[PDB]
């Protein structure tokens, strides 16, 4: 029947009716009668609107066709067939400008001279019922209503047909002709008996074709079609299927509880292999500092000028020579790299002005040390197919290494109290509330007990090094810079100082992914002779550069000075998380604050003062031959801060895995120590998971050693 609707009406009317049907979601293929009804209503309203043009005053010319004028002044403004959004927008605009009452439902047209709406409908049912439904639907109707039935019956409110009777006759002729065509076709009865269901819309989503053929294959094994499965599920009623299958299931599937007792846990199985070596990006325990008193803060000053000034204080420089080769490198290259750095410092010093940053010359020594041209050339697989040695990238388990004694000593030295002030925090908003005063007192205590720790020196070193490397690699992506290490502190008497640990020489740093590597040969001063712990300096190339003359409790001692050269690398994510290293202070201080507040809750008064000064209640921290040694709250704070700093410095996947799998066992042990009667389903699996993480990371091995010691002391 699509031919009737497509032919008997104008193309524009059918087009906009198609748009309306698509808007409401219907499909013309199924609800053809609704399509015809929509087209007929639209034609009725358009014939109502057309051929009416108001003028200066309240009258119209009602031309027949093709009689426009500069004074358009359209008598009607069609509202129907505009889309819901546009229709409501225009209705609201005209109602606002005129100030009338907006009809609840969408009208058909509007009257400008009279300033009221008009509603027009087409009905197959009895006209009077439709008219009264329209009238009662339009609450407090100020809008004229008009009804046009096919048989010709007409009605309205007050019989105020404000239209030319010729237009009425034309619409009557159009409707009569449409009725004649429908009767000739024979769908007129269907239209008459189909108007009841046109208003309601039913969603007709369905599955057919390929989707149904996929649905018939996505059921439990013993079902054949989706409809059968739905029929089965709908008729489903519970009849003890679970309790019936439990007995049928094997009795080997159980969750036997194995009690956890004081004897159950065993020491973790630390790996075995060659001792581990240093892996941090800068020396921690063996870090000399060439200092010079300087009234500057934080970032004030040009780093190169500060570095050269510090270098011009130590007068004991000798001719460098290697004293602990790299065992895998071209050490003469390291020696020449140091020579070149020293010559370049002399060069910059001789210059008039000090450049903000200095780019090193691209010599063979830096070229090899920084690994330039090392990457194999990228090639497509079409030609590099028959190559004899073509393989997959070596992806094997990391080499196993055992725990050395040096990491414990480094962690020991990274908790002592220095005689400087490595962190100087800015001011904060003036305190008013008493909580602010109490917080200020407690914060003075904390920042005094943490500013003097050496872990804070490591924090500041790491932050500065990573910031400098990131900024230099983001700007000079093609030149070898020279980034001296700097750190500033206040002595015990308050005098400011600036320090110079060594130098970094960033390599080519075209970083694309947040895991790429920028190689930087790191040159560091130190006073510790490598021929004492040779298994620790595996990847360095120590040189002997000078001979200091330091003053001690005995006076002049004259120890030699060493330079620990090495290559190294760091990615764009390690640099970011090294720049963000100041959260260690927050972690440790939050823990200490929690402990102090927990104690002070019991005793209704602040306990920080006696905690930090009276050397009151102490916690078990550390392990000496005499047993476990207690430590004051200050040492607990410093130890936790050092632990956080080392977590940041020696971060690796092994640490994450071990931390989780060991927190599990720690909670089990704590539950045991609280007489809660713990119980485990598979403890051996937990131990195997824990022991899989300890591979070669020195920090992870040290943590496992601590855990073994804790298990020994606990449960006993």
């Amino acid at each position: 029947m699509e031919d009737f609707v497509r032919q008997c009406f104008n193309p524009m009317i059918v087009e906009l009716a198609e748009k309306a049907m698509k808007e409401y979601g219907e499909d013309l293929k199924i609800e053809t009668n609704k399509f015809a009804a929509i087209c007929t209503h639209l034609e009725v309203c358009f014939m109502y609107s057309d051929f009416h043009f108001i003028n200066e005053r309240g009258e119209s010319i009602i031309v027949e066709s093709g009689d426009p004028n500069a004074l358009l002044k359209h008598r009607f403004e069609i509202i129907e067939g505009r889309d819901r959004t546009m229709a409501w927008t225009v209705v609201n605009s005209i109602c606002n400008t005129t100030g009338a009452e907006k009809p609840k439902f969408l009208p058909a047209l509007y009257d400008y001279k009279e300033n009221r709406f008009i509603e027009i409908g087409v009905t197959r049912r009895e006209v009077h019922i439709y008219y009264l439904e329209k009238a009662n639907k339009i609450k407090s109707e100020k809008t004229h209503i008009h009804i046009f039935s096919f048989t010709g019956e007409e009605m309205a409110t007050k019989a105020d047909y404000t239209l030319d009777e010729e237009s009425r006759a034309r619409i009557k002729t159009r409707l009569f002709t449409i009725r004649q065509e429908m009767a000739s076709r024979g769908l007129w009865d269907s239209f008459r008996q189909s108007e009841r269901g046109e208003e309601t819309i039913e969603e007709r989503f369905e599955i057919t074709g390929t989707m149904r053929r996929l649905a018939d294959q996505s059921l439990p094994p013993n079902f054949s079609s989706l409809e059968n499965f739905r029929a089965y599920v709908d008729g489903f009623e519970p009849n003890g299927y679970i309790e019936g299958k439990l007995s049928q299931m094997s009795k080997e599937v159980n969750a036997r509880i194995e009690p956890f007792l004081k004897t159950t846990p065993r020491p973790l199985r630390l790996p075995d292999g060659p001792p581990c070596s240093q892996r941090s990006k800068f020396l921690l325990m063996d870090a000399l500092k060439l200092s010079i008193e300087d009234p500057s803060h934080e970032g004030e000053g040009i780093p190169l000028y500060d570095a050269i000034k510090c270098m011009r204080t130590f007068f004991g420089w000798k001719e460098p020579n290697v004293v602990k080769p790299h065992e895998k490198g071209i050490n003469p290259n390291y020696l020449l790299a140091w020579k070149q750095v020293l010559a370049e410092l002399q060069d910059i010093e001789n210059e008039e002005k000090i450049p903000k940053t200095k780019n090193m010359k691209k010599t063979s020594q830096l070229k090899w040390a920084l690994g330039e041209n090392m990457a194999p050339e990228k090639v497509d697989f079409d030609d590099c197919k028959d190559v004899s040695d073509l393989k997959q990238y070596d992806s094997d388990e990391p080499e196993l290494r055992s725990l050395a004694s040096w990491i414990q000593s480094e962690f020991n030295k990274a908790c002592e109290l220095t005689d400087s002030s490595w962190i100087e925090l800015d001011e904060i908003g003036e305190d008013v509330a008493p909580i602010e005063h109490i917080a200020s007192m407690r914060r003075n205590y904390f920042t005094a007990e943490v500013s003097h720790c050496r872990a804070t020196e490591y924090i500041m070193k790491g932050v500065y090094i990573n910031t400098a490397l990131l900024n230099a690699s983001c700007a000079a992506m093609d030149d070898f810079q020279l980034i001296p290490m700097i750190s500033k502190c206040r002595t015990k008497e308050g005098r400011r100082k600036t320090n110079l640990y060594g130098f970094i020489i960033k390599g080519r740093s075209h970083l694309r992914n947040d895991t790429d590597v920028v190689n930087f040969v790191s040159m560091e001063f130190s006073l510790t002779d490598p021929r004492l712990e040779p298994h620790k300096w595996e990847k360095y190339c120590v040189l002997e550069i000078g001979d200091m003359l330091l003053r001690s409790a005995i006076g002049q001692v004259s120890r030699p000075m060493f330079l620990y050269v090495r290559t190294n690398g760091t990615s764009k994510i390690k640099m970011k998380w090294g720049m963000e290293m100041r959260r260690c202070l927050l972690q440790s201080l939050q823990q200490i604050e929690s402990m102090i507040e927990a104690e002070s809750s019991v005793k209704e008064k602040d306990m920080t003062k006696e905690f930090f000064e009276n050397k009151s209640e102490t916690w078990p921290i550390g392990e000496s031959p005499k047993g476990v040694e207690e430590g004051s709250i200050g040492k607990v704070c410093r130890t936790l801060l050092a632990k956080s700093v080392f977590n940041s410095l020696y971060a690796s996947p092994q640490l994450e895995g071990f931390s989780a799998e060991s927190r599990k066992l720690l909670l089990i042990v704590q539950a045991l120590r609280d007489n809660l009667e713990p119980g485990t389903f598979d403890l051996g699996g937990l131990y195997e998971a824990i022991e899989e993480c300890l591979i070669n990371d020195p920090w992870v091995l040290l943590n496992a050693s601590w855990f073994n010691s804790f298990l020994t002391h606990a449960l006993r």
Binding site: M285, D286, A287, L288, K289, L290, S291, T313, F314, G316, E416, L417, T418, D419, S420, N444, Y445, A448, E449, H452, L527, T528, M548, L549, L550, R551, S552, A553, I554, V557, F612, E613, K615, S632, G634, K635
Partner: peptide, 25 residues
């Protein structure tokens, strides 16, 4: 408040290995 660690050993070490004096100062 001035921190004071019982293990201070402020006189134990003849010189701080990291932060020495070297210079005549």
């Amino acid at each position: 408040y001035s921190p004071t660690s019982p293990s201070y050993s402020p006189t134990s070490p003849s010189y701080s290995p990291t932060s020495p004096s070297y210079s005549p100062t």
